[PDB]
Structures are given as C-alpha cells and as structure tokens.
Amino acid sequence: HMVGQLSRGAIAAIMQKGDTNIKPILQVINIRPITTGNSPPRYRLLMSDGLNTLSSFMLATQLNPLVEEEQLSSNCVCQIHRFIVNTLKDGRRVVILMELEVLKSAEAVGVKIGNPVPYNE
Numbered sequence: 504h505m506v507g508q509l510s511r512g513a514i515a516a517i518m519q520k521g522d523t524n525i526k527p528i529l530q531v532i533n534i535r536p537i538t539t540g541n542s543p544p545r546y547r548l549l550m551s552d553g554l555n556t557l558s559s560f561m562l563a564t565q566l567n568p569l570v571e572e573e574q575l576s577s578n579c580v581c582q583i584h585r586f587i588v589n590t591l592k593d594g595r596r597v598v599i600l601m602e603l604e605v606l607k608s609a610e611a612v613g614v615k616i617g618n619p620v621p622y623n624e
C-alpha cells in the first residue's frame with residue numbers, strides 16, 4: 504500500500520490551513536535548479552503527499568549538499584521537520600524546506616508513489 508507511506512492531505516493542510524507544525528512525509532518527484540547567478544544555487548522541488556503534487560517548494564541553501572551529493576533526489580521519501588511559508592507579491596505561496604530527513608533513498612523507492620494530482624492554489 505505504497506501511498507500509505509506518505510502524508511496524504513498534508514499539501515492541502517499547508518496551503519488551505521497554513522499548518523506549519525506538521526512534520527509531513529512527502530515524496531520528491533523532481534528537483535531543478537533555479538537561475539541564481541552570482542550567489543549559491545537554489546533548488547525548486549515538485550513534491551507529493553500521495554494525493555497531490557505541489558511545485559512551489561524550495562530548499563534552504565543549507566541543505567544544498569543533500570542534492571549535490573545525491574542523497575535527496577527524484578523518488579526519495581522525506582520527512583519535513585521544519586518549513587516556512589512565504590508569499591510572493593503576485594500571491595503565490597512558496598514552501599521553504601529548512602530541515603528534512605530522507606527516510607528512503609530514491610534507489611530504495613524507485614518509482615513515483617500513487618497517482619497524485621496537481622494542487623490548484
């Protein structure tokens with residue numbers, strides 16, 4: 504029952520209720536660098552809770568080594584221990600991941616879990 508490994512409903516919680524105390528378990532679907540220029544890279548993540556995906560996650564720069572040393576990569580399952588929500592001038596919310604754990608490596612999971620659908624706002 505693989506979707507049982509993920510915090511189904513956590514993305515709605517974060518976006519609808521603004522719940523910041525949960526420590527949800529999410530799957531990384533994709534990771535991409537953003538254009539930064541003369542400052543450290545920043546990574547944007549498409550994450551799943553098993554029900555929804557959400558594309559507006561960003562990694563705190565302190566966690567960059569996780570991506571660069573390939574421990575945090577597509578398909579891995581993570582627990583988020585600390586995150587902040589920030590809102591852009593245009594109204595979009597960005598979820599900044601400040602502390603997380605990898606609970607299962609990409610290589611140990613191997614696939615996108617379930618069939619999550621994009622969260623709409």
Ligand SMILES: CC(=O)N(Cc1ccc(-c2ccc(C(=O)O)o2)cc1)Cc1ccc(-c2cc(C(=O)O)nn2-c2ccc(Cl)c(Cl)c2)cc1
Nearest residue numbers: 537538559560561562563564565589590591595596597599
């Ligand atoms: C002002 C603000 O709210 N920003 C977030 C933000 C807040 C806080 C910390 C923060 C706090 C602590 C730390 C840390 O420790 O690192 O970081 C980070 C980001 C700045 C910002 C915003 C947009 C981008 C960007 C660019 C590119 C690109 O090129 O393609 N795309 N985006 C982008 C566009 C839309 C979304 Cl929904 C997302 Cl997730 C990213 C980029 C930046």
